[PDB]
Amino acid sequence: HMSNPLGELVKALEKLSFKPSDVRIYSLLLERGGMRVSEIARELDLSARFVRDRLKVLLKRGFVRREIVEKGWVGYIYSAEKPEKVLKEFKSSILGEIERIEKMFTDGS
Amino acid sequence: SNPLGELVKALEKLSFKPSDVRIYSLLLERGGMRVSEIARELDLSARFVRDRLKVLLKRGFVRREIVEKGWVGYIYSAEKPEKVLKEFKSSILGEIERIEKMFT
Ligand SMILES: [Cl-]
Ligand SMILES: [Cl-]
Ligand SMILES: [Cl-]
Numbered sequence: 001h002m003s004n005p006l007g008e009l010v011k012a013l014e015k016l017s018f019k020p021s022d023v024r025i026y027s028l029l030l031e032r033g034g035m036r037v038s039e040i041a042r043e044l045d046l047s048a049r050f051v052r053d054r055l056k057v058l059l060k061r062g063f064v065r066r067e068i069v070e071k072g073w074v075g076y077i078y079s080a081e082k083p084e085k086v087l088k089e090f091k092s093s094i095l096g097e098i099e100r101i102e103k104m105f106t107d108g109s
Numbered sequence: 110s111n112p113l114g115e116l117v118k119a120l121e122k123l124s125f126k127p128s129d130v131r132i133y134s135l136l137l138e139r140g141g142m143r144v145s146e147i148a149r150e151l152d153l154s155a156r157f158v159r160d161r162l163k164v165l166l167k168r169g170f171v172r173r174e175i176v177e178k179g180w181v182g183y184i185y186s187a188e189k190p191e192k193v194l195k196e197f198k199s200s201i202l203g204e205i206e207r208i209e210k211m212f213t
Contacts, residue, residue, distance in 0.1 A: 002138055005190040006170065007130045009197060013120060018113055027111040063113070083112040083212040090116060091205050098198050105190040 003104050012097035022054055026063055030080035062089035119204040129161055136187040143182055169196035
């Protein structure tokens, strides 16, 4: 019945895991520059809905940003945050998770 | 080469097998044990338990003492949770820093 630091870390790693498709989207954008949902979908042979779904996650995690295009067509494209930014955000997220887990394992009072 | 791909690889290396969690739990709950005892209780291969304990030892999550009453063997025990978290934090920070340097 005892709480388990390894088990808690497993849950944290799952929460911060990446789908393979997230890696493909991020890597495509870093290489090619900002792209529309439709362009990403065609390039990677994924559905537009699935791409939108993963973009929401990557935006909230701070790994991708959006920016307006006004070039006849008007809409948003999506751009990779730079590696230094991605790694800064990931570091903050995992440290946050560890800090929460630490509260379960304090000694004394 | 991209930071998410490198994080995936690093996070795989820092991952735990479900058995690791069970091995740690057993040692924390019941105290220091021999490999054969852990394997019996968990219904795992003794070789497998042995190899996972070697991984956990290198990571700083278990310790061992040599004992020789008859045949030589190791008694493994759980490191305390705060040491586990401290070591894990150090390790994952080290990995992120290494990946940071790949790009700088
Ligand atoms: Cl996927
Ligand atoms: Cl679009
Ligand atoms: Cl042994």
